[PDB]
């Protein structure tokens, strides 16, 4: 596996980094940059050799989505849910509906919106980019997921919230409100997404270290770590703020023997 | 004077929707849509308790 | 600025009351009977045609 | 002593029950058996002792002794620099003058001339007024019952000299009949021109009684509103208050806010005194929360010591602003960090600054982090009839706040905006206010 | 006949003789493709009939009746606003996003004033040509003015680069020679 206790020196080691100290009254982005832990996996060949728009779900430990929602409370860009869902999803999926099933376990939909309003009202780069802006969580039925990248615009594309995630009301036939209500569960707080580009560079995104206890964070990478072993050959793990230098944790030198 | 089946049930809709508090059935949206003046909602609901429901 | 500093009134915001007040009419007269439900209506064509 | 004790009609009672009052404060414990005595007064008082309610107290007691009817007289006559000191000054004597019988009124420059005209066609038993308003209804009102004046009070007369009132407060009193008149008059200082005109004024010989950097913000005045809100979610779970200038401002920010669902206490003359006490209470003893108020009602009253004094309009009396940040240091052990929000005509006022010689530091903003509800803002506006009229009551009571405003060469009607001043408020079009420009 | 007579013999006389400015502002109008596609939005803006009306006032009456009271939902109409008094009206708030001007009104004087309140209102204005083709998009059979306040998201930022589209078309073309006194040459 991996050593848990060199995870444990780097994120200490993190920790003392963003420790480190006319000025703003609204704090800078850069600022809130720099605080953040981001998951680079260098391996071969992460190319389907084809563009992987889709975002793939790693099972998580830990949740930082409802961390997230509690410093979005305090936060100026608030956490807001987005669902895009068919017509006749709409038509039957009423929003008291969603919100009894999520108070459940305390959560929220901000919004769902079909793809005919995504291509009628929001068919204008500037209302479209600053509809999107204003989301964070992004969820598309698995049919529309592969109708939305002409609709979406690729200023959607180029970020990872901005990115839709595939979900499935469906689980016969028709939908059950029950797939939908227990698949964002799953989806919320049960996984955790993953943009897959070109080249051998992977970047993943975990989240701000005020968020959530460093010895989770640890189980959380260490998790997702195993997970991506066992699904890729891997060059090298370099874990970093975005603001700060890398930081090698494992790496598997026989790999790039096996490539070739 | 009575009051007429609709509105009072629309009084009614109200009163199982809010309670009894007035901010909160004033700044509602649904069931609310004419705007009802802050008061008028206290008088109508209070004729509406006098005829039915105490 | 516009010219006039005239309040808004309060009947461009809601729901337009004198619509209501005509279909309150319309339920008063199929109350009575005296107009057919277009539903019913089209009953009565597809009958009277055969 | 108490106000329950002293010899008073009971709708006073109830009133002063109501208010919450029952002790004296001890200057105005002093000025009372004076005021009550009928002799002509000049007193040293800090501003917001309570020194309205010193005078409505005996005033109310004289209309009371002499019940006359709305079409007999005015008597009663109140004379005050500021419009948002008269709306205090009138927001509290409205329930004193509710429980009574007798009338009350408002004479601002700056209010529709036909409604003030009908309501001294009316009459109306107890005046509260602005002096450069008071000649043009002197002199251009026709019936106006002048004739009896029972009383007279003048308030700050440093600020009517400091404005420059005090030659149309001249032609004022020799309109002003003498012998009836009895005249009270308050100011924390005196100067000798203060004193040429209470030797007019008070008929008796009268007896008396006397007793650091800062932030500054430039912001354009279409998103200072959206950057009050931005930085407000930021410092959110720290206690800060807010300056503003008019009552209708502080409540419909407060109405605004709260209908954002983030925590917000209002702070007005138009706020009930009880209540007013209850909220200044809970923000006291809460001591993480958000306090919208106008300038002179946050003079009023102590402050406890804050993270933030935050001005968003602009200052009643700068400066008593310089030195209410200087008390407000040397007073507060704990750091209060004090900043005011600024529009690019307001340059001056910071060499005004530079004229108070204490240091500045300017705040920056990042365009990037703007929390963009402004959309929503009107969307709003559009919806809900409520937000719209309270709305269109901050703009236009925040225009006639300018208008009211001494200091022309800090601001000037002609140098702002007025649809970025709506769209700050939320108008994509600026409401029409009767506003000279 | 005399009728033909005197309405061939009507706008000989008319250009034989100096028109003042304010009018020719007037056939100084609007060019095929910017009215083709203005008149393509106001027909996705088209008001209600009578017809139509009376139509959904029987179902939610019928609605009601039964009772089947559905629910307390509607958004609010849009449409085009063609009342002349009403659409001044519009104007000096001021509301009017657009406003269409024929050119043919037999009493001119009823719209002089119009392309001068929209200029000093800044209102984006545009002279249409032909009152009928107002009608037609108004369900009646004139209408001379055409005002549009309230416009779907969908269709927001269509209007802002039509109004640029007018701006340049209209205010930028015609707007010295519109201070000129047309007319006057015989015929």
């Not at chain 4, 968003?312 to 507060?332: E, K, L, M, W």
Request: glycine share 4%; charged share 30%.
């Amino acid at each position: 596996a991996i050593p848990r206790e060199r995870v444990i020196k780097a994120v200490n080691e993190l920790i003392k980094f963003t420790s480190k100290p006319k000025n703003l009254l609204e704090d800078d982005e850069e600022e809130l940059k720099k605080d953040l832990q981001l998951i680079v996996v260098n391996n071969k060949s992460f190319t389907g050799t084809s563009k992987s728009f889709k975002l793939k779900l790693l099972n998580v430990k830990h949740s930082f989505y409802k961390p997230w929602k509690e410093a979005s409370a305090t936060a100026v860009k608030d956490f807001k849910v987005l669902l895009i869902l068919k017509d006749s999803d709409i038509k039957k999926v009423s929003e008291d509906d969603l919100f009894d099933q999520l108070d459940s376990e305390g959560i929220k939909v901000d919004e769902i919106i079909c793809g005919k309003d995504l291509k009628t009202v929001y068919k204008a780069y500037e209302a479209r980019n600053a509809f999107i802006s204003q989301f964070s969580l992004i969820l598309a039925d698995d049919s529309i997921v592969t109708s939305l990248p002409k609709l979406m615009g690729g200023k959607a594309y180029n970020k990872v919230e901005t990115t839709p995630i595939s979900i499935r009301t469906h689980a016969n036939k028709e939908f059950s409100l029950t797939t939908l209500t227990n698949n964002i569960k799953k989806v919320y707080m049960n996984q955790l997404p993953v943009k897959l580009p070109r080249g051998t560079t992977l970047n993943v995104h975990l989240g701000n270290l005020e968020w959530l206890r460093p010895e989770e964070f640890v189980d959380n990478v260490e998790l997702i770590s195993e997970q991506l072993i066992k699904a890729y050959q891997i060059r090298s793990i370099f874990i970093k703020t975005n603001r700060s230098p890398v930081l090698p944790l494992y790496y598997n030198q026989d790999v790039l023997d096996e490539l070739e | 004077r009575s009051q007429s089946e609709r509105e009072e049930e629309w009084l009614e809709k109200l009163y199982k929707k809010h309670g009894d508090d007035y901010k909160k059935m004033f700044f509602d949206k649904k069931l609310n849509i004419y705007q009802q003046s802050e008061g008028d909602l206290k008088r109508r609901l209070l004729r509406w308790k006098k005829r039915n429901g105490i | 600025m516009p010219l006039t500093a005239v309040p808004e009134p309060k009947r461009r915001f809601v729901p337009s009351k004198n619509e209501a007040k005509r279909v309150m009419k319309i339920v008063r007269a199929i109350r009575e009977g005296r107009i057919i439900p277009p539903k019913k209506l089209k009953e009565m064509k597809x009958x009277x045609x055969x | 002593e108490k106000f329950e004790e002293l010899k008073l009609s009971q709708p006073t009672l109830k009133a002063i029950e109501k208010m919450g009052f029952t002790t004296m404060t001890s200057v105005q414990a002093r000025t009372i058996p004076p005021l009550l005595a009928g002799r002509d007064v000049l007193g040293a008082a800090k501003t917001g002792s309570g020194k309205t309610l010193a005078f409505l107290i005996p005033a109310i007691e004289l209309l009371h002794s002499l019940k006359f009817k709305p079409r007999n007289g005015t008597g009663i006559i109140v004379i005050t620099p500021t419009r948002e000191l008269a709306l205090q000054i009138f927001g509290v004597a409205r329930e004193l003058m509710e429980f009574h019988s007798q009338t009350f009124g408002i004479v601002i420059g700056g209010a529709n001339r036909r409604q003030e005209a009908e309501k001294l066609m009316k009459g109306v038993n107890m005046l509260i007024a602005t002096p450069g308003r008071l000649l043009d209804h002197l002199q251009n009102t026709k019936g106006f019952v002048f004739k009896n004046l029972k009383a007279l009070i003048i308030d700050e007369a440093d600020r009517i000299l400091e404005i420059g009132f005090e030659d149309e407060m001249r032609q004022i009193i020799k309109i002003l009949p003498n012998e009836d008149r009895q005249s009270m008059l308050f100011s924390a200082t005196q100067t000798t021109k203060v004193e040429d005109l209470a030797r007019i004024s008070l008929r008796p010989g009268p007896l008396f009684i006397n007793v650091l950097e800062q932030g500054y913000v430039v912001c354009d005045s279409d998103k200072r509103f959206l950057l009050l809100f931005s930085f407000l979610k930021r410092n959110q779970k720290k206690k800060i208050i807010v300056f503003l200038s008019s009552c209708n401002s502080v409540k419909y920010y407060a109405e605004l806010l709260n209908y954002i669902d983030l925590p917000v206490l209002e702070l007005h003359g138009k706020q009930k005194q009880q209540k007013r006490t209850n909220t200044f209470f809970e923000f006291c003893n809460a001591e993480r929360g958000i306090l919208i108020c106008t300038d002179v009602a946050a003079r009023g009253l102590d402050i406890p010591a804050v993270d933030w004094i935050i001005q968003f309009d602009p200052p009643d009396d700068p400066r008593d602003y310089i030195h209410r940040v200087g008390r407000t240091a040397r007073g507060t052990k704990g750091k209060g960090k004090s900043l005011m929000f600024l529009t690019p005509n307001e340059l001056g006022f910071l060499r005004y600054l530079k004229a108070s010689k204490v240091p500045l530091n300017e705040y920056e903003f990042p365009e990037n982090k703007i929390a963009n509800v402004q959309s929503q803002l009107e969307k709003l506006i559009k919806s809900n009839y409520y937000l719209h009229q309270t709305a269109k009551d901050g703009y236009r009571s925040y225009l006639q706040a300018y208008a009211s405003h001494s200091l022309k060469t800090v601001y000037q009607i002609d140098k702002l905006d007025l649809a970025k001043v709506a769209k700050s408020y939320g108008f994509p079009v600026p409401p029409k206010v009767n506003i000279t420009i | 006949p005399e009728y033909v007579r005197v309405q061939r013999q009507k706008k000989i006389l008319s250009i034989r003789l100096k028109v003042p400015p304010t009018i020719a502002q007037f056939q100084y109008t609007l060019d095929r493709n910017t009215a083709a596609e203005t008149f393509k939005l106001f027909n996705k803006y088209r008001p209600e009939t009578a017809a139509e009306k009376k139509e959904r006032l029987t179902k939610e009456a019928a609605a009601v009746a039964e009772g089947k009271s559905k629910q307390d939902a509607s958004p609010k109409p849009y449409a085009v606003k063609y009342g002349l008094n009403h659409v001044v009206a519009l104007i000096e708030n001021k509301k009017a996003k657009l406003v269409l001007i024929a050119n043919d009104v037999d009493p001119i004087e009823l719209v002089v004033f119009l392309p001068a309140l929209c200029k000093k209102m800044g209102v984006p204005y545009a002279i249409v040509k032909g009152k009928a083709r107002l009608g037609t998009l108004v369900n009646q059979k004139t209408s001379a003015v055409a005002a549009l306040t309230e416009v779907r998201a969908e269709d927001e930022a269509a209007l802002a680069k039509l109004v640029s589209t007018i701006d340049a078309n209209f205010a930028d073309k015609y707007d010295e020679v519109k201070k000129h006194w047309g007319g006057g040459i015989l015929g």
